[PDB]
Symmetry: C2
Subunit: 101 residues, 2 copies
């Protein structure tokens, strides 16, 4: 379990490195899924050994630039049908409604 | 040798990961020593194996 009060998972991820746990299933929101990976990159846990399955359906909204060349095995689902031209046109119109954010 | 023109050592560090080279002696300045480590953290080479 992630810690309740703080948002620093260094005491959790150090117990996961020491116990040799290379296969992790995170049950988080995507606001906290980006928070663990910056605390898993500050530790030595973004290697080619680790596999991360994420329960959330908003993995596609992560800004994964630094984890892209590491060779990490991030996996997850997506229900948002971003392949259709008609569906992708509505999402482009959604970005033209959130200018002040 | 680090690349001359660019300051992106991704084609160098990928050949060092693939060749299993865990013991590296950098001959750099400290302005470029900080530049390699951000390009060694973007790859999976800041582990407990590397010296």
């Amino acid at each position: 379990q992630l810690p309740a009060d703080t948002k620093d998972a260094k005491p959790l991820l150090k117990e996961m490195k020491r116990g040799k746990e290379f296969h992790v299933i995170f049950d988080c929101s995507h606001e906290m899924a980006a928070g663990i990976l910056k605390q898993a990159l500050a530790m030595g846990m973004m290697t080619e050994y680790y596999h991360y399955i994420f329960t959330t359906l908003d993995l596609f909204a992560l800004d994964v630039e630094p984890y892209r060349y590491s060779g990490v095995n991030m996996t997850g689902f997506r229900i948002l049908n971003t392949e259709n031209t008609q569906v992708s046109s509505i999402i482009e119109k959604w970005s033209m409604e959130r200018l002040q954010a």
